[PDB]
Design brief:
1 chains, mainly alpha, 33% helix, 0% strand, binds magnesium ion, RNA-binding, Large ribosomal subunit protein eL8
RNA sequence: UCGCUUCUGGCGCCAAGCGCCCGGCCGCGCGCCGGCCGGGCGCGACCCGCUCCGGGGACAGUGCCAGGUGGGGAGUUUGAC
């Protein structure tokens, strides 16, 4: 009777975006960057 | 094309709405059910993946030598009768 949906729109310019996983874009520290690049060189070279 | 917002000196969030399931405390007892109370993949809010996004790039640039220029600067000299 009173219970209603009232949804959101995660467009552009419209309502604020939610919290999703941002693991790929973190500013990782030094000891982590270094080893990952170290492994990649064993595939490039 | 794209996560869809252009007539106006407005508002916009914190866990949203719900949507499917698991659980506890009281009446049912067939308990993973009815009153108070919670978790959950996260459904909504698609998956997978090896460099944060772009721009350059085996040249710039750094080290050591070789040659030219170089009163900006340094040292000095600028006869005797
Ligand atoms: Mg001089
Ligand atoms: Mg002198």
């Amino acid at each position: 009777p009173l219970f209603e949906k009232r949804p959101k729109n995660f467009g552009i310019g419209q309502d604020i975006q939610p919290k999703r996983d941002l693991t790929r874009f973190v500013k990782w520290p030094r000891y982590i960057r270094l080893q990952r690049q170290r492994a990649i060189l064993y595939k490039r070279l």
